[PDB]
Design an enzyme around this catalytic site. Structure first.
Site, PDB file in Angstrom:
ATOM      1  N   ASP A  35       0.821  -1.204   0.000  1.00 12.49           N
ATOM      2  CA  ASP A  35       0.000   0.000   0.000  1.00 12.49           C
ATOM      3  C   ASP A  35       0.864   1.267   0.000  1.00 12.49           C
ATOM      4  O   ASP A  35       1.363   1.694   1.050  1.00 12.49           O
ATOM      5  CB  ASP A  35      -0.899   0.001   1.244  1.00 12.49           C
ATOM      6  CG  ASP A  35      -1.809   1.213   1.321  1.00 12.49           C
ATOM      7  OD1 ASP A  35      -1.936   1.914   0.300  1.00 12.49           O
ATOM      8  OD2 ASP A  35      -2.394   1.426   2.412  1.00 12.49           O
ATOM      9  N   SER A 199      -0.701  15.550 -12.073  1.00 14.59           N
ATOM     10  CA  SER A 199      -0.965  15.188 -13.458  1.00 14.59           C
ATOM     11  C   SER A 199      -1.208  16.443 -14.293  1.00 14.59           C
ATOM     12  O   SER A 199      -1.716  17.440 -13.798  1.00 14.59           O
ATOM     13  CB  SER A 199      -2.161  14.242 -13.520  1.00 14.59           C
ATOM     14  OG  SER A 199      -2.563  13.993 -14.853  1.00 14.59           O
TER      15      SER A 199
END
Length: 330
Positions: A35, A199
């Site tokens: 994770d 992004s």
């Protein structure tokens, strides 16, 4: 040193991925959920409340000659999905794919929430976010990666998750045969303890690319892709019959649909998520309403590039002095 381990979807939907981990002496192999959105290595154990164990493999520290109680240490964690676990702490030898760390903090669960109990396939979590998020008190502990880093050939790990198929976590090297083209690297902020990056925009299907900054985290421990409501609405508007359902808890769509792809930007590069990756199947057994793999982050407080996004790429988690993230197509 290096390590290399195969990671395997837990079910036919790729709801999560499990990776075998060797703990203790002799080795006890547990299947852990790696994770990158948390920083605790915790396991089901011989100390876990019996009624809260249902099929998981447990770590038994009394059977490990290298286990040592970390005196006074406790831990307690709550995840974004509302699940939680807590317990005490041992140090022991932990190996992943041939890479061994001695003295790793292994957090032994005394209590786990129902979602963990109900998932027989996950024996615990191995956190790979920054150690500043580790919950051990009163002495915070380091992640497996943080402990291994100085020994690694290169201070990196890579996630290569499969779509409906196994994939690979590598530590200490970049497998140049595992991706196509080049790897595009992008800046990371560690201020919140996550692999947080920005992004450069998105496209829906064959549509034009929208240049827009989207701050979010690369999180292997989250199944879906969570993005701003504007972006998610633009995606689902291209699917006939798709709608946001408050009763179901997100966007659903007719199971008869063919989904468009979704592209996200990494610098000037582009990662394409095929439409099929965005199908999470019937909302309930036998339903013709299917659950979407792109969902709104509104009210999460952060955008999350979860498995839906990451499995479309070869992803480099670069833990150099100034960390960065790399993405390549594959």
């Amino acid at each position: 040193s290096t390590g290399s381990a195969t990671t395997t979807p837990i079910d036919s939907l790729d709801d999560a991925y499990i990776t075998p981990v060797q703990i203790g002496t002799p080795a006890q192999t547990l299947n852990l959920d790696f994770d990158t959105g948390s920083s605790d290595l915790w396991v089901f154990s011989s100390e876990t409340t019996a009624s809260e164990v249902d099929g998981q493999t447990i770590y038994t520290p009394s059977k490990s000659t290298t286990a040592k109680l970390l005196s006074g240490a406790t831990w307690s964690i709550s995840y974004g999905d509302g699940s939680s676990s807590s317990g005490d702490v041992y140090t022991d030898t932990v190996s992943v794919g041939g890479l061994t760390v001695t003295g790793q903090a292994v957090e032994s669960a005394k209590k786990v929430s129902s979602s963990f109990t109900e998932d027989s396939t996950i024996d615990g979590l191995l956190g790979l976010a920054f150690s500043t998020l580790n919950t051990v008190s009163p002495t915070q502990q380091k992640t497996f990666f943080d402990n291994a880093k100085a020994s690694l050939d290169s201070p990196v790990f890579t996630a290569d998750l499969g779509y409906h198929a196994p994939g690979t976590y590598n530590f200490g090297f970049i497998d140049t045969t595992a991706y196509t083209g080049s790897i595009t690297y992008t800046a990371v902020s560690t201020k919140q303890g996550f692999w947080e990056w920005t992004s450069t925009g998105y496209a829906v299907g064959s549509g034009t690319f929208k240049s827009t900054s989207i701050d979010g985290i690369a999180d292997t421990g989250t199944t879906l892709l969570y993005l701003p409501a504007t972006v998610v609405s633009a995606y689902w508007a291209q699917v006939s019959g798709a709608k946001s359902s408050s009763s179901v808890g997100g966007y659903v769509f007719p199971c008869s649909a063919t989904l468009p792809s979704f592209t996200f930007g990494v610098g000037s590069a582009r990662i394409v998520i095929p439409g099929d990756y965005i199908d999470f199947g019937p909302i309930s057994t036998g339903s013709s309403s299917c659950f979407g793999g792109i969902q709104s982050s509104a009210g999460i407080g952060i955008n999350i590039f979860g498995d839906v996004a990451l499995k479309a790429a070869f992803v480099v988690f670069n833990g150099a002095t100034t960390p960065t993230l790399g993405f390549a197509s594959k």
